[PDB]
Amino acid sequence: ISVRGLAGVENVTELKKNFNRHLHFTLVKDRNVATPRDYYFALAHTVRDHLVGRWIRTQQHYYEKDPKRIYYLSLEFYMGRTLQNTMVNLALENACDEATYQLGLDMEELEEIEEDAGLGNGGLGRLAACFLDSMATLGLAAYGYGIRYEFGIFNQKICGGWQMEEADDWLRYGNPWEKARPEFTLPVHFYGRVEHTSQGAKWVDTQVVLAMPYDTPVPGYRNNVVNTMRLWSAKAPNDFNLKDFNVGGYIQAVLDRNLAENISRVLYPNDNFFEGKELRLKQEYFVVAATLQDIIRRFKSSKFGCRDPVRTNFDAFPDKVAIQLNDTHPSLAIPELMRVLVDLERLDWDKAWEVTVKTCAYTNHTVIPEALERWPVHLLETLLPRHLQIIYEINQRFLNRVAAAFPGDVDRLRRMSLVEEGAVKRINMAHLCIAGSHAVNGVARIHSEILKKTIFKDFYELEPHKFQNKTNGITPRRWLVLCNPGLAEIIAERIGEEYISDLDQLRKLLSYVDDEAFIRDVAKVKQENKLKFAAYLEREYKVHINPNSLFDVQVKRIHEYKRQLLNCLHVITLYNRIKKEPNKFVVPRTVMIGGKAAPGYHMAKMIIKLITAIGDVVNHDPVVGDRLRVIFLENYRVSLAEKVIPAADLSEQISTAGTEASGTGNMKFMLNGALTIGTMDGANVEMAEEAGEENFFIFGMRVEDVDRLDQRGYNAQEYYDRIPELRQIIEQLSSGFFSPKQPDLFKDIVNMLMHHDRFKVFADYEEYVKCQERVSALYKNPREWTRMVIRNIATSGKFSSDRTIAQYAREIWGVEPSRQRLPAPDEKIP
Amino acid sequence: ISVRGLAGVENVTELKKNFNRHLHFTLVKDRNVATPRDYYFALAHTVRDHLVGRWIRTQQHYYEKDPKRIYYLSLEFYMGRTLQNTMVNLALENACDEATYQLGLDMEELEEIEEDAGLGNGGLGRLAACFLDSMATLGLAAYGYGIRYEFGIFNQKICGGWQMEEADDWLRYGNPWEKARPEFTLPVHFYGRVEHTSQGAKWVDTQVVLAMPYDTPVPGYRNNVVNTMRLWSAKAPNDFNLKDFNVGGYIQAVLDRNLAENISRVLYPNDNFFEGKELRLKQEYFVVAATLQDIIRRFKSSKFGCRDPVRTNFDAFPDKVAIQLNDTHPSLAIPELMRVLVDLERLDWDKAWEVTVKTCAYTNHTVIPEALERWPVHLLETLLPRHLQIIYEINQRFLNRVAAAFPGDVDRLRRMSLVEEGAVKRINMAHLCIAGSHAVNGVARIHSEILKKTIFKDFYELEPHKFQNKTNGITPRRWLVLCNPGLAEIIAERIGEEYISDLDQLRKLLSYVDDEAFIRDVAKVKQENKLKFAAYLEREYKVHINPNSLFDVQVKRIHEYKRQLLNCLHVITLYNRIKKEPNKFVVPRTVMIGGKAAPGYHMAKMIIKLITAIGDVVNHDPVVGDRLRVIFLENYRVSLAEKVIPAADLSEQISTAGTEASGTGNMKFMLNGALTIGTMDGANVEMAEEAGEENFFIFGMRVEDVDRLDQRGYNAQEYYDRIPELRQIIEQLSSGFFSPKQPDLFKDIVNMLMHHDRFKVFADYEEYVKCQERVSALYKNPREWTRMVIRNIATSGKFSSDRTIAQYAREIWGVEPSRQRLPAPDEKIP
Ligand SMILES: O=C1NC(=S)N[C@@]12O[C@H](CO)[C@@H](O)[C@H](O)[C@H]2O
Ligand SMILES: O=C1NC(=S)N[C@@]12O[C@H](CO)[C@@H](O)[C@H](O)[C@H]2O
Ligand SMILES: *Cc1c(COP(=O)(O)O)cnc(C)c1O
Ligand SMILES: *Cc1c(COP(=O)(O)O)cnc(C)c1O
């Protein structure tokens, strides 16, 4: 059937009875009233059973051996569905397929019932998810720590061409994967005030919110390692949230508990954008405060909570603990670690600071200013008074270091300060992270260089040793084997299966680049993938597409910097050229654009409307026929990504040079047989460098060009004046060609494009359509297109998150990855 | 070990492995980190397993045979713990005891970990719970329908002698007994307006709240019948509760979902008191609206949703459905049934009315005016506009009936109206229930007569056939076998086990009233019970009591009508007599008073403080010694009741004649070997009539006396003037004898007692202490005390809820109870 494992005789039988056990005893249903949803659950529980044994021994294992622990703190974990991934990592896929088949059910139909765990916004959240999979696969004692939002990223609905947001109640039917651990609930404090008494400061009169943990298993790939992802949920204490007496109402006091519990209610739907709301800051401290107590408790046990030097010496803390900050969201971990160490454990400042810097490491994910976290001082002052005091003290000592290093450089002092003066004082969380971490890294080579050369230049000059790079990656398990079994199979037929956990081995595919059979196969799976997607489209969304055309897709969050608008200009151009010469042949294309716009992002929502507006005209023009279709992919998410990416021919990574930190969707397309048209931005540079620029469709300005243009001054009118095709498009938008009933509907887009385009869309227009012509030319030559595809796939190995993780482990955490199978799952009950 | 069933070889082995299965796979724990709470859960899941098989076949059974269904609607179900009760009804108690013993665990210690399901206030809620147990034991196709509050009756804490309330988060660690059924979610409407168009009225522009059901199994006693209790939970829709667009905030819209979900958040803690809050009315309509759609859906299937006459003829509705209204809380079921039948199904009014009256039956639980539900018209008008219109129409036609029957009687017309004029117009829900039900019943003989003679006199004259009586009862399973196995054993040694489901057989115990062995045994178990309770007291609450003294206990909600104050007067009297003649012998007593006060009930909270105030003085007076102890039993609830009742010697049922509808605690004490000192009120009359007045300690005014006194006019001063002992007590309270630091602390109590005592405490004082002297005299004669006890126990059979239910079944619902074992639980998987 494929190498989804063995369909053993004993195990298919065992699976079936356990499926029936759960359908009866767990779901309390009988075959005569069971619905597909019940069947999905019976299966999920049956599969979950297989990893609890391993989960228990893995955790027990870490307790006995006591290795250095890695704590990955993030406010986002974009997991997606977990049934198939678990089967894949446990080699249960074929057995389960066989078993459900014999039970007369279609496993694929049941897999579609699982809701996505959309606890993330996009790239930052999905990276964390890929990282977790890689850390388990590499046998690291790693824990993912975050917030269990009851409402994840909103479900997107397109009404009248407009995006409609609706709550993502992913827990509505329950989550069979998580395990509530009420017994490990911890208290978190807010507000209060600081008392300075005799031997130390005291954080007093605080409001308490409880943090209840929920653990989700994270299985490594076929190594019997099952790590843990711990998500915190907010709960109101039953005392003060009722006991602070003297009138108000008993009923009201109980109803008001949903005020402390609102902290973990919903994920902020912002991508690459900072919103300074109090609820956000509470979420940030909540995850940090709870996570740190858990980390220290585990440390106090270790082998110190037995003997060792005997005396809670936190000198060994950094030798046993490593905490990675996924962006600045969990940045309060630095002043919170100091608070505990200094205020509670009573360590002297300097010893505490040495420990803190040695265990903390910070990763930066963006350079756009509006994405930078700068919290107003009055907020921190009210919500976290002691922390503000600690931050000021950290700043005081840091600036003293600067002054000593750069005597007289008074401007450098204000530039490097963690405290920004002006309208309202703010705290620059990024500066905080750099100061309190022993390592700072970018997520792609060019992005990391940009941090050193621009944004954190002064910091780099002070401590050059801190700055590093760790190019992002993606897990080959979910992003190949899971979503593209057909491609994984033909690759395995030639080079084996060892590449799933050693992607570098894909290079061996280079020697089949002239193989006639392979070329035919690679081309066949892509065709099968496009037919399946073309079907799914009419199935769930309804209104036909042509599977023979070129599948041109750009899927990612909607942003001005991602330039979906530039893609739009090209689409309208294609349309205008066809209308000019109807009977001329052009390569048919189906351009698919999908992505969510943050609810408050007006321009991004305007762009979604433009896209659907273009589709309304283009898709109903009889002269165009099936040569050009414009489709907006609704509710783009992880599960949807697993469907489109394997079916794409052309991957659009067209951000303005210097704005996309790395990108990861680009890597997903490369591994799945799509060719890339893009700018020299983020990881695109390393991808073209790995495949060879001849096998990549690069165009537009490089970072240097963008700067040259900024010195000069960007004037969009120039481009409008010298390019008739561009002018024609702008006048079409301006006059209502795409919005008849509302002729001025797109005035904001045109106005912006002509007067305030921060991402110089027009500057890359000419080179973009010229480059698009080259891809069309190559598509007309199936054999050569596929051969270039093989060059990309065979050369994507470097982009596996196993490589990224191995580098974090060795260069930042100080731990050695291992591909050693943990001693089977075998029963055991001590 | 006792007759808690057989400890079979095969089953103890089977139990142990399943216990281990759950500890591992369900709790994901290993013996080395499992805590007593984990063990309790492993056991609960193992026990729960045994009844899912029976649950499925019982429900399937009702589907095939299609009998008339009984729907018990109540806003309260006071269930308590469910582990032991389930073991008892499944004959699993000894096997489980043995198995956990071999696993090295103490089953009793684990049972204490289970949280009480306190979804009720007291008697009304516990009756529903007893009823459910009896309906299953009698093989009736009955369903309990209510609300799944996430916070039940508050946990009571005594601080400085004052009651402190704290949220009852009973779901904090999860509920292993319930089964969420998200697939059966239903929509409920609120607000909106009424449109009158061509062919009928339309309820329009309503706000929708979803009702999600949770099913809890209700096992019958050893008959393999497992009925269902369906509790509704409020959920916000994900559309409009986000989709009603045009600014407000996406985050805020999501956070505001906890506004529609607040409907099922907390139980109103009022006992015998009406609070007209909008949240309460929403709860009432919520349970009714959801329950009715479920009932009709089930009906539409039956054997009509196949063939029969073919044409949804609701003429057979009352032949297949019976809905019992537990008080007026679910009274909107009447106008809601009409709404659906008339507005949706399009039945003519009269056919709809005939159907409604024939399926609805109403039970009244109180006669005090402040407990009567009278909803302001402006509330119904805003929240349920169509229902108000239906109520007015029902009223119009009803009053026409009255006028025709009593021509010219204009005052009778306004007295009987469902609409009360005055300050604000209100709707008298009780009048509504009587008009739309084919049966109205009281809960004890005297209470039922009072309804006919007083409160509903006019209604009784109009339709005498509607009024009936159904004296309350208690389940012998939980209230004997479960809480008092020792007594159940010795009874079974002589007369067998058939009495557990046929309590009348207890009469056979009369012939052992002179048996020397039995007298010694009955006295021995009571002594063992008192020693266990005396221990529990120091264990969990700490500060010693004497197990040789007479256990004088009054446990029930705190109310002026229950007269805990009268009990207090007696206690202070005993104390004053001892201080007068220290060296005189008196029978030692431990008087225990426990009960919760509604949070807003100031006087009731003042009484709790008085009780603890008396204990402060009495318990620390060296002259008193161990002859008198005053103890306030904290957080009185079902699980606590199961501990005190079996250990009591004297049961206090001293309400003012005519105020306690029935009472059920009185019945619990009688069955467990306590003697009763009380008034001729509620079921006390039938109890003394069953045991013989010679074996009962009756005192005080009868109903007639109370009325005579009211004609005359009640003047407390008279009693104060003629009784020195009473005067002395009042002057002790007034002067601060019981409240040194705050001498005027009890001015409200004294003021009330002297000028506004609605329950004439002083009028029964003399006869009360005189009667108390008689019980003390009899206690001095162990042999005769125990013989009188045997007379009570042997004669309590009539008070089993199996008797009550059998009467409701035959005289109201029209169904025949059956003690036929359902065809085993045996596997089966069709
Ligand atoms: O997706 C992202 N959202 C933010 S904010 N930063 C992001 O992080 C990802 C993971 O490092 C990068 O791949 C994206 O380029 C970057 O925009
Ligand atoms: O306990 C009760 N609370 C209210 S209100 N009415 C009650 O109902 C019980 C069940 O019928 C009766 O036993 C009580 O006498 C009555 O007060
Ligand atoms: C991989 C992924 C992303 C990141 O895509 P980019 O193109 O780097 O912005 C966002 N959303 C989902 C659903 C993804 O799978
Ligand atoms: C039986 C019971 C009641 C009712 O007691 P009465 O004395 O009739 O008021 C109230 N609360 C609990 C906990 C009960 O078990």
From Swiss-Prot, chains A, B:
Q: Out of the domains of life, which is the source?
A: Eukaryota
Which residues carry the post-translational modification Phosphotyrosine, per the record? 191, 214, 460
Q: Name one GO cellular component term.
A: skeletal muscle myofibril
Q: Please name one Pfam family that this protein belongs to.
A: Phosphorylase
Where does the UniProt annotation place the signal sequence?
Answer: none
Q: Does the keyword Acetylation apply?
A: yes
Task: Name the cofactor(s) required for activity, per the record.
Answer: pyridoxal 5'-phosphate
Its EC number is 2.4.1.1
What top-tier enzyme class does this entry carry? transferase
InterPro entries cross-referenced by the UniProt entry: Glycg_phsphrylas, Glyco_trans_35, Pyridoxal_P_attach_site
Q: Where is this site: Involved in the association of subunits?
A: 96, 130
Residues of the site described as Can be labeled by an AMP analog:
143
Q: In this chain, where does the modification N6-(pyridoxal phosphate)lysine occur? A: 668
Query: Which GO terms fall under molecular function for this chain's record?
Result: glycogen phosphorylase activity; nucleotide binding; pyridoxal phosphate binding
Task: From the UniProt record, list the reaction(s) this protein catalyses.
Answer: [(1->4)-alpha-D-glucosyl](n) + phosphate = [(1->4)-alpha-D-glucosyl](n-1) + alpha-D-glucose 1-phosphate
PTM field: Phosphorylation of Ser-2 converts phosphorylase B (unphosphorylated) to phosphorylase A.
Q: Where does AMP bind?
A: 30, 63, 297-306
Which keywords appear in this protein's UniProt record, sorted alphabetically? Acetylation, Allosteric enzyme, Carbohydrate metabolism, Glycogen metabolism, Glycosyltransferase, Nucleotide-binding, Phosphoprotein, Pyridoxal phosphate, Transferase
User: Where does the record place the modification Phosphoserine?
Assistant: 2, 417, 501, 734-735
Question: In UniProt terms, what function does this protein have?
Answer: Allosteric enzyme that catalyzes the rate-limiting step in glycogen catabolism, the phosphorolytic cleavage of glycogen to produce glucose-1-phosphate, and plays a central role in maintaining cellular and organismal glucose homeostasis.
Known partners and oligomeric status:
Homodimer. Homotetramer; to form the enzymatically active phosphorylase A.
Its name, as the record gives it, is: Glycogen phosphorylase, muscle form
- What's the source species for this entry? Oryctolagus cuniculus
Q: What is the lineage of its organism?
A: Eukaryota, Metazoa, Chordata, Craniata, Vertebrata
